[PDB]
Amino acid sequence: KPRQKRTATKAYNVTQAFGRRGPEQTQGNFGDQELIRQGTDYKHWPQIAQFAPSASAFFGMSRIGMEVTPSGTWLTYTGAIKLDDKDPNFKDQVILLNKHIDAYKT
């Protein structure tokens, strides 16, 4: 039920769970219309979920902070994930990710 523990399915789209993809910082941007309505049932979700961090790597790699804004109390995070330049599917990994970064605008 917690928002960071939700999972997007076909019966529970990413828009239904994580709001409409928008330009604001409080909104998401990753995801084309394919994996938004399908969620984890996307035909290449394992090819995408292989970059989502674990529970330990989330706090080990990211830069965590604490904000108290007008909404409430937030646990901020920011980081980067290096892609394997020697992966045989790396040339295809950089394509599928760009297909969904800011895809709500196109």
**Interface with a copy of itself by CB under 8 A: which residues?**
2-8, 14, 17-18, 25-31, 39-40, 48-67, 71-85, 90, 94, 97-98, 100-101
Identify which of 23, 7, 103, 24 has the alpha carbon closest to the alpha carbon of residue 71: 24
Closer to a copy of itself by CB, 5 or 105: give it.
5
Closer to a copy of itself by CB, 33 or 65: give it.
65
Does residue 91 sit in helix, strand or coil?
A: helix
Which H/E stretch holds residue 15? helix 14-18
Nearest distance from residue 97's CB to a copy of itself, in Å? 6
Closer to a copy of itself by CB, 82 or 105: give it.
82
Nearest distance from residue 106's CB to a copy of itself, in Å? 15
Nearest distance from residue 43's CB to a copy of itself, in Å? 15
Nearest distance from residue 104's CB to a copy of itself, in Å? 12
Gap between the Cα atoms of 11 and 40, Å rounded:
10
Gap between the Cα atoms of 45 and 57, Å rounded:
20
Gap between the Cα atoms of 99 and 93, Å rounded:
10
